[PDB]
Each structure stands twice: as C-alpha cells, then as structure tokens.
Symmetry: D2
Subunit: 264 residues, 4 copies
C-alpha cells in the first residue's frame, strides 16, 4: 500500500494528503487583538512562557487559501481551495517571541489532515472574508485607503468570530508580519484501554515555512468579537481591545517541521 496520510491505497491517490511539498497561496484578513494575559496564559502548553512584553496580545486571521503539490493540484479547486480561521497568542520560547496557535478552523478535510500532521489543531468550520475585485464597482471594496473588509467564522452552525477592517496605508515592512514563528502541538491519542491519558504523539513543534512571501500588504483599523458557542472555548479569550487591521497575500511551501520537545 502507498500514500502519505490515510487512506493508504494501492495507487496512493485516495489519501487525504500526499507527501510534501505542500504549496500555499492565500489572502489574509487579519486583526490584532488583546485579551486578558491570564486567559492567554491558560492556553499555553508546557514549554512556552507568557510574553514579558505583550502578554495577552494575539492575532486573528481569516484566510482564503489555495493549495497545490507537485502536479498542478490547484486545477482541482473542489479539493485544493479552502478557507481558514485561526488565532495566535503572543508567547515566548526560551526568550524568543513566538506565536502559539490554540484554535483553528477550516472547511476542507484535506486541509484538516494536513493541519493535524503539522500540529495545527484544525476542526471543521465555515469561514468567509470580503474579497477585492480589480474591476471595481459597488460590488467590491477598493484594495487601498478606505476599503472595508468583513470576515466571519462559524463552527457546528454557531458563529464564533466576526471582524471588520478598514485599510489606511501600505505596510512599510511586509516581511516583518511573519516575524514570530508559529508554535503548534502534534497530538494523537491512544485508544487502548488504560492508555487514554498516554497519547502516542505529543510534541511541541515550530512551523517551518519555505520561500515565504508577503505582498499587497495594507494596514488600518479593526473591529473584532469572539462569541460563546457550545463545544468551543474561543470566547474564553475575551477581546478587551482591538489593534490594527491587516490585509495581505501570503505564500509559502511546507516540506519540514521542527520538533521542540517530545513529551512522549
């Protein structure tokens, strides 16, 4: 049998995701927000410490992704396109600023599988963001000063996040938006009786992104709210204040992943 993820199969096609490289091109609506430092700290895994300078700061990102591998998979958009909502929280790893990801939602099963392999704790959700069309007109915002963009995320039919940004000026240092590495947790439990508290995989990891590119980056103001929902804990990170709003394209390739600590 062949394949990278399940299902393994005779021809290695049925698997949810093939082996890397995984290529990504996306458009991001992002919102800087600030929650209670203690609430953010409660989500951190062992190995990460509160950020001494910006504890409580986080970033909420709504992304329209397009994925591809080595065979022009982006020509099959029914499988390759997906929409994603995640938050990261400022933290430190041994004195270095990092971005811990506690929650993330996608509308695609292949994306969910790729995320689990990376340690992104992906669940299914419905994610939407306003789109900018270059033809212009009253059906689209301008990708420039004054342009307004909305974004929402739902899980199991429940709205969990709603955001709006208003662009003001270009980002001076676009590459700096990706300065903090994302930290994740690869986790796969055991089902054998007596071992439900002894996961087979449980390791802190740092996301490794090849050939990262950011373009058409804009910054402005933002409004954001997290909403309580049954079976979710996002709203346990209350939005006390919103920072800047961001809009940019993002691209990278995934071929690697750094294990920081293997907790068995």
């Amino acid at each position: 049998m062949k394949g990278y993820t399940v299902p393994l199969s005779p021809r290695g096609i049925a698997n949810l995701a093939p082996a890397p490289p995984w290529h990504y091109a996306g458009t991001v609506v992002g919102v800087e927000f600030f929650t209670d430092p203690a609430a953010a700290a409660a989500t951190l895994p062992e190995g990460l410490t509160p950020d001494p300078d910006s504890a409580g700061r986080g970033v909420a990102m709504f992304i329209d992704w397009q994925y591809s591998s080595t065979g022009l998979e982006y020509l099959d958009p029914a499988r390759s396109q997906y929409r994603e909502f995640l938050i990261t929280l400022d933290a430190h790893c041994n004195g270095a600023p990092v971005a811990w990801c506690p929650y993330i939602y996608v509308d695609n099963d292949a994306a969910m599988a790729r995320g689990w392999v990376q340690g992104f704790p992906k669940k299914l959700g419905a994610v939407h963001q306003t789109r900018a069309y270059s033809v212009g007109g009253p059906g689209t915002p301008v990708l420039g000063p004054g342009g307004q963009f909305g974004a929402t995320a739902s899980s199991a039919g429940q709205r969990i996040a709603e955001a709006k940004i208003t662009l003001e000026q270009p980002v001076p240092d676009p590459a700096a938006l990706m300065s903090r590495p994302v930290i994740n947790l690869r986790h796969f439990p055991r089902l054998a009786a007596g071992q439900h508290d002894q996961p087979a995989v449980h390791e802190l990891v740092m996301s490794v992104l090849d050939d990262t590119a950011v373009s058409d980056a804009w910054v402005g103001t933002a409004d954001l709210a997290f909403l309580p929902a049954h079976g979710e804990e996002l709203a346990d990170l209350p939005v006390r204040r919103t920072g800047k709003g961001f809009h940019f394209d993002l691209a990278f390739t995934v071929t690697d992943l750094m294990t920081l600590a293997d907790h068995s």
Copy 2:
C-alpha cells in the same frame, strides 16, 4: 409585511433578497462550446428560435461572485459571496441574436431567489474555479500566457461539468443579451399546467464593466447525472476558453412576451 422577497417581516430584514439595486463583482472562467443544434433547439422556450448561423454554440461560465446592495452588504460574505455555473445557448429573438440560459447553479439561497426573480432558473450546486493570487508562487497560476485554470460544478453530490482553460492572449476590446424565463406555477387543483407567471425576459445590466480579459484554449465536458439534463447538450467540440473580471448592477428587467 415589509420586504422584497419572502419572508416578508415587520422590519424587512429577514427577506432572502431586498429590493434592488443589486451590485455584482465577479471573476469568470468560461468556455465556448458547440453541441448538437437540435439539442440546443429542444431547450428553447416559446418566443425563441434557433440561430440561423451558430445553432449549437453555447458558453459555459463558472463565476466567483460577490454581491452587495445599498448598505455594504459585501461586509457579510457569509451571505453575499457565492459561486455560480451557468450555460447559455445561441438563439434568435425576433431575428436578433441572443443567449438563452436553460440551466444555472449557485451555492447560495439568496442568489437562488434573486435569480428566480430575474428568470434565471437557479438550482443549488457546488461550484469551484482555480483562483489567481498576485503574490505568485507554486500555489497559484499566473494570469497571462500559459496560465491554467480548472473549474467544476456538481449538483446533489453529482459532478455535472468539468473544465480547464489555458490562457494565450489578452483581449483588448472586451455581445448577446441574456434571455431568461420568469416562471412561477400554480398549485390550486386543476391549474398545475397554468402558471401564474410565465414570461420571456431580457436581462438588463447597468454600468457593465469587464477587465483583465484573456482568451486561450479550453477543455470541457458535461457529465450525465440523475435529475439533471445538462449532459443532453454534449460538448462535441470546444472553442475559446476565457478569463475576466465582470461587474454590473441590476435595477430593471425587460419583459418581452407574457405567455401567462
């Protein structure tokens, strides 16, 4: 009892679609195709006749739409964004070349309702098209020569159309009006064959704009499916593939013939 479409309500908010103006901005992946003239003619309503020059020609379009009205509704993409697959067939209306729309599919209930009001016979479906990102890289095609775009449409979990285009040249000067049929039946016993609304209409588009248009080669197939008839217009050969942005506003509709 305020509102434009149902549900009517005390505040006029719950309705699937409010009154026009309806604004649209979209990106189109399309394929010119040719089917059997007799098959195309079989779909034509009363009032339309076969095209004496291009009978059998049609256009398949996959569109990523964004809608808005008078209140920045595009800030609510969960309701305002939708994806659409339709075909048009060359025909004549009183000697004038037109484009008849027999089938169209969308993934949004508000778009379905707006379409019914326009005479677009919209059903629900799953529609996807490759997207071009300006950042570039291996996760996206590049708009321009050699850029490849795929598109698909499904209905009730059944794939009904698959397409791919390869762009070759830009179009410097970016023509048939779309003809639709407003149709709303009666349920009163004895009147199931006497629709309350049954009228040929011409789509009216305000402030139409097309940008960044490209043409190239194309592959297209319609697939047989239960409860669908699209594949009864088999693709005997393809013409040009094309890619462009499209914008217009809807405020009006032209009644051509009332068959009720």
Copy 3:
C-alpha cells in the same frame, strides 16, 4: 418545454420539483411557546386577525422529512430527504382559529422551491433533531416516558433556535394536533423598474393536506429559545414561556392549495 417549477427542460426532469402529487413522511419535535401578543400581531399579513383567546401562542417544529412523488423518489434520499424548522403563530381568519407561518428554514433546494409554490417562505438553514433508535442503548433516547430530544436550527452559520423536550405520556388526541389550518402567503415580486413594490403574485393561501396521518404521538415538557442573528427576525418573537413539548410522526399528500385573497 416540460416541467412544473424551473428549470423547464425537454424531458421535465431537471425541474426542482415536478407537478404534484407530493408525498411526505416525517418525524416532528415540537414545542408550544408563548411570545408577546404585539410581536405576533406585527408579523400577521393583511387578512388575518389576532387570536382573541391565545394571542402570542405559537408552535416551533423541527421535522425530519422524506418526500416522494409518483416514482418512488424516496429511493433517492440525496434529493428527497430534508430537515425543516418552522414556527406558526395562533391567529384568526374571519373568526376561525388558524396558524400563520412567518418563518421556515430547510436544507434542500427542491423543498425550498416546493415551499415557495405553497407560500411557505423557506430559506436555507441547518436543522437537526435527536433521533430514537429501536435497538436502544446509550446512544439513543427511548421513544416513551423520560425520553429526551434536542433540536437546533441555524441560518447562514448563525444559531437561531435551540430546543429540548422530555416525553411524559401519549398525546390524548393525536388527530387534534393538526386542528389549526396553516396560513401562508404566495409572493413573487416584479423586477421591472417602477414595479418593485407591485408583486406579480401576492395572495393569502390556506395549506391543503390530503390523507393526513399522525402516529406515535407523545407529549411532555419543553425548553425553547430563539437567538438573535444578522439577517433574521425570529428572535423578535422572544420565548417568554414554553408550553408542552411534542414528538410524533406526520404524513400527508399535497395536490391542492386554497387561495383566500389575491392582493396583487
């Protein structure tokens, strides 16, 4: 061209719904509720009167439907099965008790089309109800005393209703559950400039059901809440108090519809 609803076609197959008869078999989770009489009155169309005895009373129903016509269409569950959430409000039509339906949600486009033809103002939604399995065990409630059933409805990814019932005893008079006729409003607007306020169809109608049958009818206690949501007005009929909860099978055939008053 052939067909009943659009699209009309050479074979009359592609249409969203064929001509009647339309057959229905369903399982209902229902909740009697009481809202503000003035709020219920605000939703009533011209021609209906507030109920002089039970103004403000309504019924919320979550239904798992199976539809069929003359050709065993229920063998195609991808098209024929759908789930439905609606409310009715007590009202009077010329001194006779009736049930006005202001809002209804389904997860199926064919059902939406059939609804519009009937005057049910259907929109898309996600509807779910707990199901009872004869095999029993910890994965199912019992269809009998003590059985608990939950139900929810969402629209555009927003939760608009959450309900729970606990069964106590059989319904004393099952047939009486369908005593109030449902009143609807067939409505189809015009798009020609200058006529956006002059609908082509605008007529009050009474639902006509053939061969109505109820079975396995139970009654008990109930909890219900409507939730505010963007683009919805259901929560403007707040649940001030809940009445009885109901669980029953329902079946009927649709071949007819009674026009009460034509207004445009």
Copy 4:
C-alpha cells in the same frame, strides 16, 4: 491543558472528541458484493492475507449514526449525528476470518477524528439512505417484505457509490451479521525532513466493540455500483456481482482497541 483529541484546551471542551466511552446507535443499509480477488488483495496491509474461502467478497454499508458519551451528547444532534459509508473486504489474519476496511466516508469532523484514532481511514463525504417511517404512507417504504431502500455516497462532489435493496424476510440469526472482526490501520505520518516515509504511528489494529446489539434485521435482494471519481480508488474494486441486501439497527460502545502489530 485538558482534552483527548486536539484542540487541547483549558476546559477540555473544545476537543473534537472527548475520551471514551463512545456510544453508537445506527441504522444500516448493507450490501454484500463480490469484486476481483486480486483487486481486494491489493488493498490488504501486511499481516493480512486473502481469505481462502471468500476472497473478493465485501460488504458495503450506509449508516445513519447517532453518537453519545457520558453526558447525553445525543441531545446536540448538530454535532452528534452523522452519516457514514464504508466497505469491508473479507480477509484472513493468522488463519482467522476478518474484515478489512480500506475506505470509509463520514459527514462530520468529530466522527472523522474518532475514526482516525480507531484506525478507520475516514474522509469527508455526503452519505444518504432511504428512511422508514412508522406512520407509513406513500412517502416511506415499509420496514418489511417489499420495502425498497436507496443509498448513495459522494466525495468532493463526486458520486462514488449507489445502492438499492428490496427486503424479503427477517434475518434468521441477527447476531451473526457482526461475526467478522474489523481490522484497521492506525497511521499518523511524520513531517520532519527526511522522515516523510517513517510514520510516527503505523500499526495494525482490531476493532473492539462493547455490548454489540442488532435489531429489526431484514434481508433481501440488492443492486450496487461503485463509480470512478478523481482522488478516489473505490471503483478500483469493481462490483462483479451483488449478494444479499440487509437492513438493521446496530448499537455498540467503544472503550478499547487491540494493537496487533507495530510497523513503525
């Protein structure tokens, strides 16, 4: 951090699936089928061998599931109800008859996660089956002689299986329907460079079902077809002949899993 599957969280609620017990109640439309012995053998993992008596035989199952755990989770059908399509293939393990599961599809993210933990190689799909209603009438088949039931499965908008059964008589020995234990493969790859062919988890497992129960079991005739689809390999198991069709309720609890061989 609390939780069984990802996401781990402060309160242990956001996780896709909590720790077992997992309770299941479902209604199965099943079809016995026969494919090419060599095609079935091509899907078998190491440790399984062709069945010396019935190589090529399989069972296609369409199931309407309801899940619960220790807190009446079936009162939240938006999360707890899901629909499932799978096939099993007759095989042998060390001379014992077993049922290997190469492919399986569900319409719920929690179900997909639970399956991965069990070694069920679940992907997202759309699955439907005709339902029998006690009220009867033209909208439902009879759960008895002559009752006809349809079932379908799609993946990424592509139909991959269509089936129909006609019931004839009760199953003589209902408990015998679950005689072959199911064999699965727990599999979780590595993303670290150089280790994309060295999965972290890769083990043959046998499904352990507690308190298995079958009821309302019927048998009859069947028709079945697998359809080719991009990104799938189900149709590489062509249906040369269909055997009997089955309709029954099924219930069990999952608390355990038996590791047969660790191939990591």
